[PDB]
Symmetry: C5
Subunit: 239 residues, 5 copies
Amino acid sequence: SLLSDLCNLNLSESTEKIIAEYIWIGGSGMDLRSKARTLNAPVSDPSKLPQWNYDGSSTGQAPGEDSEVILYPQAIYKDPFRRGNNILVMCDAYTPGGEPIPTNKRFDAAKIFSHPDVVAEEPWYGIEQEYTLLQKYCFGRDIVDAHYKACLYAGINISGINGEVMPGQWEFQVGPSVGISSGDQLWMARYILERITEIAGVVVSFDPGAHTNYSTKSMRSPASNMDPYIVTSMIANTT
Amino acid sequence: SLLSDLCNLNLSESTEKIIAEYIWIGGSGMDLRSKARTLNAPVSDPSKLPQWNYDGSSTGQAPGEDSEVILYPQAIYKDPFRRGNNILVMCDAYTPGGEPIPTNKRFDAAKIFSHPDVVAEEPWYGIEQEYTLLQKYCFGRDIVDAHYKACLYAGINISGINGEVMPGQWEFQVGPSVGISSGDQLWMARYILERITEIAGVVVSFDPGAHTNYSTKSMRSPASNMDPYIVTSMIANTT
Amino acid sequence: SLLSDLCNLNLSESTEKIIAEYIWIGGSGMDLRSKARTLNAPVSDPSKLPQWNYDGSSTGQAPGEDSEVILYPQAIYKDPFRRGNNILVMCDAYTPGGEPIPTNKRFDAAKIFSHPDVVAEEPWYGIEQEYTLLQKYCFGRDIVDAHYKACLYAGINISGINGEVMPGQWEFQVGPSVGISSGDQLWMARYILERITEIAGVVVSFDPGAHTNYSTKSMRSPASNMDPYIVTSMIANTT
Amino acid sequence: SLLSDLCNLNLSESTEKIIAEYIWIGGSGMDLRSKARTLNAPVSDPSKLPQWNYDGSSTGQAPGEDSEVILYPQAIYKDPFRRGNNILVMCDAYTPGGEPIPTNKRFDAAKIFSHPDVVAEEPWYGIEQEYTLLQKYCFGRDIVDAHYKACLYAGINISGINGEVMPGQWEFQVGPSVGISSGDQLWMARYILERITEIAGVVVSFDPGAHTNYSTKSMRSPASNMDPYIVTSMIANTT
Amino acid sequence: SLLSDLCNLNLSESTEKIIAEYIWIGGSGMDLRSKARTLNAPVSDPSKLPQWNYDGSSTGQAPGEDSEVILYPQAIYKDPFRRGNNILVMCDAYTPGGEPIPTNKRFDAAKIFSHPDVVAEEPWYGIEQEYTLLQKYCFGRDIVDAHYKACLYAGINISGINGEVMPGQWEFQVGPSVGISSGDQLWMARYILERITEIAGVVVSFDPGAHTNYSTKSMRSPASNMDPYIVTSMIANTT
């Protein structure tokens, strides 16, 4: 009863102001980090949403002398937790000057997908990621049901889950999305899980496979902890 | 308060997407299994539902070299746990090629009920199933009341419950559903109980009797853990 | 949070069906029993409700060779727990053939009240019932407040309660109702208490008195565990 | 979750009936106690409510041979707990025959305030009541906030609270009300606190000084556990 | 369930009365204190709100012989813990006669910001305060989420928060506001945190560096536990 009467205030009636949560990829390459900011009005097109920046030296992606790391918005989705107009934004990391940071891995994938052949093919990607739940075939079904509902609420194109033979570990399927967004969504969806898991007190382990589905218009008419952009771009170049 | 604010989000306002839960009889013949999937729009006609697949070797119905088992949609009911428009779909198991799996037991019952004599008789079937609740005449009445409410919410034609002399064990009845659907409903209703029981932390035992009552147009003018299709077809052939 | 999200579903929106809880007096003469049934549509007139049956041998009111006992619907009230259209029904016990069961004590009271002199007098009855609460002037006050509100919700003509000198015990006063219905209501209201007490985990003791108030048209212009029909009929035809 | 789903039923939709809580000063002079009754329709004028009574022998204000104590409704305010239309009534004690009971202390104050000079002056009274909370400047702020909101809900003209230097003990100011009503309100306000405190499981101690503020039309143009009527009437006679 | 059904009553429907909470800086200079009062109608312009006063001897800002300390309304904001129309008011401390109290630090800041040069420059201030949570980059995120939501609800122009490297300590950045109001808001916002922390049972420590951002119209076209009015006025005089 205590402290939960808050966190649900319909701030829209009182203030037109909104919050945006900046999500980016941690320096280690297997960690994800995020922190908040306030915007005067809701923003749905990532072009309108202004850039921002942070201190990267503490994140292990730049030395202390030059720690500032820039961030440009890439994906805009609705926030599942702060159920108002509040939005989550998926943004990538850039070192000062405009060049992509070595841990970005997004700039190359985007420039590959920008090629006319790839966009003409319009590839569809579905990555089959399996995870496990640990204490701090078809335990805690509430966690997975909440995750599924939240992912469909945000805008993640997730197509289905299942139980599996190993005790307590599951798998969820992300549906075919238009181009690199597919890979994007994976990371974003992954983020949501931890927060929901943080509500319960469980530990989510993604440690190892990740089956990749590929399709193109020319025909229709991997590790779990691996960056989807790496496999999504690599399979496109190969095919 | 935690994690229960989720699982109730009215996803209908945000997305037109729906969840569909695929439920089918397990390989052992007494086990019942399911896993989830996502559909673009709700569909209440079982014809329009696409088929789907799964792995049967892990479920004890395939040796392993040929593990894939097919699924055809048979029954559509509303989901009580996810509410909204979410639907449970009852499906039967078929080995590749279209032949029924040995543990199916539905194809023969359906072909018997498809006989013109049986459909002309229009049989009405009422099953008398009793169960017991264990730790993990007229204890935990909340469980049975919740089960009754959920069953009437879904569409199960359940006609009533009662207490009995043995401590804590009850019995519920399925009314006059049209033909083989009656048998269908039994299995489906059984499923719901476990999930509701899964909410509480009890174990449901159906171990042994299930009285079977039959009626047709001609006259009007069994074990608890036994397949309703077997009894509903055997008595139909006898009469 | 768990399992209480159910038991409150507005089943009226989904299905037009209703539950009815058939209520009768136990074989011991002071125990009260009931079990559920389903009706296609809500009905507020006790005449329309069909009769029903049960097993009396397990209830100690008939030997095993001839155990079936009949039930006729007598009183219709709204259900306090199943807050929809669901209705409780108070019914009396009859041995097969149409004769009243020895533990009925109701047919004779009804036939006495059917006398033209009695209906001309239009007697008003208020029975003063005292009870006590045990662990399993003016402790568990929420229990008695809930009882008061639920009884007012159902249709029971109750009027006022209080605490008294002995610790923890209360008493509730039933308003003057039209004839035998008064006695009826007592029993029905009695039932509600146990269910509400069943929600909490208390023991309700009715062991001893029961003050009876009598009034007729002529003038205006007992133990707690005693059947109200006995005192209501005995105090009548005597004044 | 259990037993609290009740006690909030909107009984107004079902029944036009209402509950009414008859409140009177205990025999010892330092106790305020009450018991319930039912009324056919809500009434906001204290004249219309019926005369009533109770048994006073156990209350220590009348011997056993002549125990009945007579009660007339005086003040009507809305109930904070049984929300909706339910009303608390503040009533005084009368020895049978029309004479005020020795512990009443209201008849003399009312007859003093009925004097033309006092009503012409139209005195305003502000009583400074302080209390302490015990285990069973500016601890359990929820209790005092609830008391504040409930008092403003009912109609008690309370003007404010604050903390104080002594650990955990507060004080509240009752605003200037029209004549003797001021004193009236103080008593009822006290009552509400215990009930709210009864929700929590605390002990409210009023043991000692209630500062009294006096004002009239002529100029504008005491123990905490002492009866407000005594000080309110005494200061009026002195001034 | 208990006592939380209260504290949320929509007092607006019943009574037009409102509560107003008077907040003033404590005598020690590092403590902030408050107490409640009642108003006939809601007040949004601080001019309309009448002055008030309190006892300062217990607050350590005046000796016992002359303890009374006056208060004038300065800032009006909406209340998060009482919702509806209820308001908080931030007021400054003055010794009797109209001169500012030595611990005020507000009159001098106001007279400096009232200078024509400063108001012409229209300075924008953003103070960056960090805090730590103790038992009684980017633990208990519910507390900080609730604080952020409450601050945006009240009217505090806070710009965003973040996690940091040291375990459990955060920082919140308040956006630019029109002149001295900026500093004002800081204090007010700080207050809210403790109350929310009071809901949970944590200890908020502000012990240190409050980064100060300064801007004016001329160019556009500090300890954490230090008074914002001191720094916001000192930097204005310097620049």
